[PDB]
Amino acid sequence: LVWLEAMLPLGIIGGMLCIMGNSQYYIHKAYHGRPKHIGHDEWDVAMERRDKKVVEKA
Amino acid sequence: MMLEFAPIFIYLVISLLVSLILLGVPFLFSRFDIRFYLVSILFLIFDLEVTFFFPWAVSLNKIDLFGFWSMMAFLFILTIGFLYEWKRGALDWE
Amino acid sequence: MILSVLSSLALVSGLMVVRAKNPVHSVLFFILVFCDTSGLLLLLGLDFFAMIFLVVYIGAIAVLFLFVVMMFHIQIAEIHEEVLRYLPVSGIIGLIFWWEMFFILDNESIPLLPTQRNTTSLRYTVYAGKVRSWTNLETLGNLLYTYYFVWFLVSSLILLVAMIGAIVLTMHRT
Amino acid sequence: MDLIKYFTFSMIIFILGIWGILLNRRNILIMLMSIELMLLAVNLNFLVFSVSLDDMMGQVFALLVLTVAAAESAIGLAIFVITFRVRGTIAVEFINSIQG
Amino acid sequence: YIAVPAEILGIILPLLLGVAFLVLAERKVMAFVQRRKGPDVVGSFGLLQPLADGLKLILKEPISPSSANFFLFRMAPVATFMLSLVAWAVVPFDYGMVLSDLNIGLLYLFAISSLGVYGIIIAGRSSNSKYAFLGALRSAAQMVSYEVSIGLILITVLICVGSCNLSEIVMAQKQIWFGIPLFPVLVMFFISCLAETNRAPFDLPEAEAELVAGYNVEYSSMGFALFFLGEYANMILMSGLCTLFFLGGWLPILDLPIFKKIPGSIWFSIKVLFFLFLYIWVRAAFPRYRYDQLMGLGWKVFLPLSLAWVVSVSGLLVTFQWLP
Amino acid sequence: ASGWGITGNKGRCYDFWMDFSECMSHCREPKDCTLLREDYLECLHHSKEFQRRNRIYKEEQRKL
Amino acid sequence: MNTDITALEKAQYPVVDRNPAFTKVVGNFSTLDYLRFSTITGISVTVGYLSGIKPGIKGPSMVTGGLIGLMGGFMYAYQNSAGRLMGFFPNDGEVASYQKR
Amino acid sequence: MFNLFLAVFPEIFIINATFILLIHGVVFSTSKKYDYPPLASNVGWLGLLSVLITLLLLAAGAPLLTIAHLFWNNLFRRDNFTYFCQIFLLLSTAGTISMCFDFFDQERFDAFEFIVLILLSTCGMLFMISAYDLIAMYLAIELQSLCFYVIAASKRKSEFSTEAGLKYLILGAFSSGILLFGCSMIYGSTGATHFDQLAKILTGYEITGARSSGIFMGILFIAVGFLFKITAVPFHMWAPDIYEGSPTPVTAFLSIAPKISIFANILRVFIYGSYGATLQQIFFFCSIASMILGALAAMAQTKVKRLLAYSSIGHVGYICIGFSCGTIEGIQSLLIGIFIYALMTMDAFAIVLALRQTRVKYIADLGALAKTNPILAITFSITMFSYAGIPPLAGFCSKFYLFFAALGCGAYFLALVGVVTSVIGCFYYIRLVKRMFFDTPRTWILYEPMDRNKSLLLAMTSFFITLFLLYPSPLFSVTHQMALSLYL
Ligand SMILES: C[C@@H]1CC[C@@]2(OC1)O[C@H]1C[C@H]3[C@@H]4CC=C5C[C@@H](OCCC(CO[C@H]6O[C@H](CO)[C@@H](O[C@H]7O[C@H](CO)[C@@H](O)[C@H](O)[C@H]7O)[C@H](O)[C@H]6O)CO[C@H]6O[C@H](CO)[C@@H](O[C@H]7O[C@H](CO)[C@@H](O)[C@H](O)[C@H]7O)[C@H](O)[C@H]6O)CC[C@]5(C)[C@H]4CC[C@]3(C)[C@H]1[C@@H]2C
Ligand SMILES: C[C@@H]1CC[C@@]2(OC1)O[C@H]1C[C@H]3[C@@H]4CC=C5C[C@@H](OCCC(CO[C@H]6O[C@H](CO)[C@@H](O[C@H]7O[C@H](CO)[C@@H](O)[C@H](O)[C@H]7O)[C@H](O)[C@H]6O)CO[C@H]6O[C@H](CO)[C@@H](O[C@H]7O[C@H](CO)[C@@H](O)[C@H](O)[C@H]7O)[C@H](O)[C@H]6O)CC[C@]5(C)[C@H]4CC[C@]3(C)[C@H]1[C@@H]2C
Ligand SMILES: CCCCCCCCCCCCCCCCCC(=O)O[C@@H](COC(=O)CCCCCCCCCCCCCCC)COP(=O)(O)OCC[N+](C)(C)C
Ligand SMILES: CCCCCCCCCCCCCCCCCC(=O)O[C@@H](COC(=O)CCCCCCCCCCCCCCC)COP(=O)(O)OC[C@H](O)CO
Ligand SMILES: CCCCCCCCCCCCCCCCCCCC(=O)O[C@H](COC(=O)CCCCCCCCCCCCCC)COP(=O)(O)OCCN
Ligand SMILES: COC1=C(OC)C(=O)C(C/C=C(\C)CC/C=C(\C)CC/C=C(/C)CC/C=C(\C)CCC=C(C)C)=C(C)C1=O
């Protein structure tokens, strides 16, 4: 069971990777109000720009 | 859209700053070997091969059989060149 | 403004290509020029070409130049010369080229002077072309291998010539 | 003003290649480098025009020109290598024996 | 955009910590195979060892030998370190967990990989030492040689997916992980990753005892640390790429509610950890090739097999009309 | 003239090109196709459009 | 892939088959086509043999010359047969066989 | 689908045969069992065979080369003009190859890759002739150029050969960049690269006051590249150095085939396109400069190769006079001049290659040749008098047309220049005859007799040169046919 000593640094590396994912995910969500959408294309950008008008001018 | 490239630039700026901080804080307290040219040439050729592979790989669904065989002919020419290099000893470093 | 920054970087880096006393330094500045060019390509929306300029010009061609120039170990005495006496000949040739060739598009492509009015509202949006947008990569790949495949294959022949010539001119088998 | 700015960028690269030919009479490696600079400028000209004209022909030819530039540099550097090997030097006074 | 620097730091800082502890994990696993204890004095279970080593390095006087390439000598480690860092901007850790959702992300990764060679070349040339120069030339040649096979394997995955978007590459493996049908391609990719990161059995710069001086032999203090950190960050990145391309990234092993309970970032992390363990294990298990032998392997074995796999995958998918 | 657009649809100036080409394919004098030709070239470079808008900007700067 | 066989210069003989299939063209080979084929191949093998004697590889040289001659002769015979079926070459035999089957 | 490729049967065959020869050569040149035999002559004979089979395929399938023209339209354009140009190119390549075997075996130039590079350059020139778009034209030109760069440096331990290669690559790459810039300017100004589209856009306007400076400078840069390729003054100085420093078979090949290919390109670009009087003036001034400089520099030469190089520069000046005048007879005369100059150059280089077996270098080395080989001295004298344009030898056609156009376009300074340069040329051509027949040197050089290939080629070209004007009808008719086919 001594070999569990070697699993601690690997566990730390895994937690580090989980942080690099989740911290950037939550900061983006807090700033934009919704999570990042994978595959934002021309259509989605045009939708957001037109939706700014359709919301604010209502 | 090119919007997604802006975070990459800001990331580069921050990574550069981290590099300067780490490197700068301790300042406070005649034998030409042709085989390298030859390996450079081979890398150039296969670099262009990968370059031409990229659009083909994303376009296979639209170009169908004609595009497949045209790329096959391209590869046949380049692979004849590769066979020539292999036979001539360009791939041997001994 | 951003194009002013990138063009200034390219101008200085290119002058360094052509004026650095050490040829290894010239190769490194050349690499800076290709980086700036890639930036311009990103501004044009051509991300495939922007990446390919890094992969091929910097990743393969400049590496070849660097390997060759580094192993040459050129002494400055062999390639040194004073360039002060070229300022006039460069002045006339540069100016004539400057006066003719920086302004060649002006009569055909007259710039739109930016006015003190919001013209952005006159941008007309056609959503029909936005239902299924094509990347630069797939637009190019739709054409290279079918409608213009002969030119593709001739380029392959050019590369084969390069391989054969590289072997025949330099090979000394141990 | 976009198109004039993109064109003058490529134009300064081309003029720099010309100047590099003019200013490097004892340095033929830099002369080769200046020729690549001109080729890069032409490639940029094709890409800018493709966008401005909304036409793909400029892009196909740009890729093929990159292939030509690669082959050109490979063969040119091979010729440089063998010239150096024969003479032991790259100085221009040792490549002037053919004349008249 | 004001919050973008926070996201960037939330990527970069945990990555640097992860590298610091990857060094410790390598030491621990190597020791345990060798029936000894690795660092276990500096901190409990040796967990403070990386901080002590980093502190020692920053408190070490820099040397900067009297060369004529004063600027280049210090900038080479900066270049390699920055290149190791910037590849992570496009790496997705889970659905929507990615800094830059590049449509051309695969080619971008290839470009970064191709750029990696310049730090080593410039370090060798600028150091004013024939041994460093020769070692740097050999290492650079090895990296460019194995980059060809890496690119061709990338093309195989691209043919299967039909998009250069890394997240799309992950989500295309919902039906089956690409590592199952393309298992030999995955083995080839892992070996090519070993060779591309100058890792055992391909670690020429580590072969000082074999009369082969490394490219960083003249470096001290934080330039040497920058080279080391870039190398280990690249090891983590190669493990991540193996996970993304062949083990389905953040996807669970089986599409079942029991497996879907645990977050995708944890799946991704566990697969990355497996590949890092394999890195260490391989270094512990085998001797190293000579330069000529590994060059022969790069050009005579991995290139032909990669090209053959490209042809076979494309031909099969075209024939039965299974293309994306 | 090719018709292949940079975003995967018909090029912006291709219909003008085709009108000009179809005109020239049967008119024995090119002066009969001058209008269509200048329409094609105007689509490529927008020279007259931008010139007219610059006249408007000029008059605005003069009356201010 | 859109295709269009239409030639710039029209056929001057009756068009038996506008775009004949590969196997149809091969099956259309006449005695003269086979004579052309065999002559080209034989000359090529002979050149391979004679030019191979000095290097000492007359056998392999014969094989290489024969491969070149086989490919060239087959291409020439195919050219003639397809041109006859398409009406570009005098095709009395093709017309006679067409007016009967 | 397969039948569409009948339009490219000749090219497919030659490319495949070249690949076969590459594989054959590399497999057996490396053979320990066979003791690494030299394969330059074996591959040369097989490649001569391949060229002749390509010629058969092309000549016998004249209508078939136009099949599926709409499908191939955006790639190339085959017609009667390209038909005859390609046939002539293949014939020239076959002759040049046939002249190489004594060089292969006696020098022991064992590199079979030489033949492969020649064949690939022939493929490139074939595609050059049929090019109908700026992109295709550039690609084919580059393939041809890269093959020449490599073969110019084939004697890779020679100072001369390496110097030739280096000068060629640098100056060739520079000129190619200039031409590509011109192509980019034309595309940007017109949105087109296909020759038909360019013809439609540019016709009817030339310089109508509102001239596209982009179109005008694109044409100029393309013309500069073309003039470099045809070795027209002032873009000529690469040619004498490259011609002298390259291996003599390379020099013979470069002297003929690229001119045919590039003149096909020039005809189909400019003649078929439209900026107009400016470009004909370009070629007019370059023709005059080439005639004058070629005459004077050739008069200065003491070495045979350099003399022939400067002679070729002068003759391309004479030929470009025909392009300048812009008439059906001008094009016909240009073609007649190209054909006759090619045959004469083949004759001259067959003699030069025969004499290279005893290392001929200087004109004075020909002394007493009328004694040591009388029939060879007479044959070489006929070539010189033909070069001088003395009637009734075949060379008289170019002189006759030069003055015909001088009085047809209405140009008397051109006629004066032609008279003076013709007299200068006659002097330096008859100097060789004087050296072989009139001089009595103290030391003689005895030359080894030529091989059968060169003797037969010399015998046929010598009958043509002496007897062409007795039966010149087929050339006249075929060249008139080609000139007409450019527009109809
Ligand atoms: C050594 C040291 C030890 C200590 C330590 O360091 C190291 O150890 C380290 C270890 C770290 C933990 C590691 C992991 C997590 C999980 C994370 O939490 C899940 C992430 C969130 C989002 O991500 C999910 O969601 C994605 C999208 O679906 C999933 O994608 C799917 O779909 C893809 C496409 O099909 C497929 O491709 C994928 O395969 C498929 O899975 C993705 O996988 C999945 O992750 C969870 O979301 C939820 O939260 C939402 C909040 O809004 C709620 O929304 C709801 O409310 C809205 C408003 O009304 C409504 O509008 C909505 O409709 C309605 O749903 C709702 O509760 C629910 O959505 C919370 C953080 C934590 C605990 C970390 C903490 C810090 C540590 C303890 C570190 C610690 C420091
Ligand atoms: C892997 C290795 C590592 C190294 C590496 O790779 C290799 O790493 C790689 C990483 C690369 C960097 C990646 C990323 C960038 C950013 C880019 O920079 C974006 C600039 C573009 C985008 O800018 C805006 O774009 C939108 C506005 O356009 C903004 O949208 C708003 O406006 C919308 C409309 O109302 C609303 O709807 C939206 O809601 C609203 O938000 C958007 O927010 C904003 O981003 C272009 O913009 C400009 O262009 C304009 C046009 O010319 C100029 O207009 C001007 O001229 C006009 C007349 O012409 C006059 O009329 C005008 O009045 C007058 O102003 C003006 O200068 C300026 O706007 C510059 C290049 C660079 C640095 C790359 C360099 C090279 C690398 C380092 C590579 C490197 C090599
Ligand atoms: C009128 C034209 C305009 C002016 C130009 C004139 C150009 C010539 C200059 C004239 C001045 C005098 C020229 C003297 C040349 C005459 C001598 C001569 O050439 O004799 C040759 C003869 O050269 C020839 O071989 C000429 C052959 C040409 C064939 C042309 C005839 C075609 C049909 C004839 C059919 C065959 C013969 C029929 C009868 C048997 C002998 O060559 P040798 O080198 O001495 O020895 C040759 C070796 N051996 C004798 C052993 C074989
Ligand atoms: C390392 C791998 C080497 C592979 C070498 C072997 C293959 C080399 C390529 C040989 C040419 C094709 C041989 C394969 C025969 C099968 C062809 C076939 O199946 O016919 C298809 C058609 O295939 C072709 O016609 C493509 C031919 C490829 C071009 C090869 C070049 C031949 C000569 C070109 C002349 C140009 C000059 C050459 C320049 C150097 C039918 O398609 P379709 O008409 O139904 O629809 C078209 C398509 O599906 C939609 O886009
Ligand atoms: C038009 C004006 C009037 C012209 C009159 C034309 C009349 C027709 C010609 C009649 C020919 C009379 C001689 C016929 C018998 C000779 C048969 C040659 C026998 C032979 O096999 O020669 C072989 C060599 O190939 C060779 O020597 C043959 C190749 C020589 C080059 C021939 C042309 C090939 C390429 C085409 C070029 C076209 C150029 C056009 C621009 C081997 O000979 P060997 O046994 O003695 O040993 C040589 C040592 N290796
Ligand atoms: C004997 O005295 C001397 C000269 O005097 C002949 C000289 O020159 C020079 C040195 C200066 C030179 C050579 C500059 C001349 C260079 C030029 C004009 C560059 C162009 C190159 C060539 C070969 C000229 C070809 C161009 C021509 C004929 C005209 C251009 C084209 C058209 C009209 C279409 C020296 C030392 C000299 O001591």
Author numbering:
A (entry chain a): 3 to 60
B (entry chain A): 1 to 29, 55 to 119
C (entry chain J): 1 to 174
D (entry chain K): 1 to 100
E (entry chain H): 2 to 325
F (entry chain e): 2 to 65
G (entry chain f): 1 to 101
H (entry chain N): 12 to 499
Sentences from the paper on this structure:
Protein complexes of the mitochondrial respiratory chain assemble into respiratory supercomplexes. Here we present the high-resolution electron cryo-microscopy structure of the Arabidopsis respiratory supercomplex consisting of complex I and a complex III dimer, with a total of 68 protein subunits and numerous bound cofactors. A complex I-ferredoxin, subunit B14.7 and P9, a newly defined subunit of plant complex I, mediate supercomplex formation. We propose that the main role of the plant supercomplex is to stabilize its components in the membrane.
In the heterotrimeric γCA domain of Arabidopsis, only the catalytic site at the γCA1–γCA2 interface binds a metal ion. In the high-resolution structure of the Arabidopsis I + III2 supercomplex, we now find a coenzyme A at the potential catalytic site of the γCA2–γCAL2 interface. Our present 2 Å map indicates that the cofactor is a butyryl- or crotonyl-CoA; the only difference between them is one single or double bond, which is not discernible. We therefore refer to this factor as γCA-CoA-X. The 3′-phosphate ADP and the diphosphate group of CoA-X interact with hydrophilic sidechains of γCA2, γCAL2 and C1-FDX either directly or via hydrogen bonds. The crotonyl or butyryl group of CoA-X is located at the catalytic site of the γCA2–γCAL2 interface, interacting via a central water molecule with two histidines and additional hydrophilic sidechains. In the Arabidopsis I + III2 supercomplex, B14.7 is present. Together with subunit C1-FDX and a set of lipids (five phosphatidylethanolamine (PE), three phosphatidylglycerol (PG) and one Q), B14.7 binds tightly to the C-terminal loop of ND5 at the centre of the membrane arm close to the complex III2 interface. Our structure indicates a second lumenal half-channel at ND2 with a possible proton translocation pathway along a chain of water molecules and hydrophilic residues. At the ND6 π-bulge, the hydrogen bond chain of the hydrophilic axis is interrupted. P9 is a small, 62-residue subunit that spans the inner mitochondrial membrane once near the ubiquinone binding site.
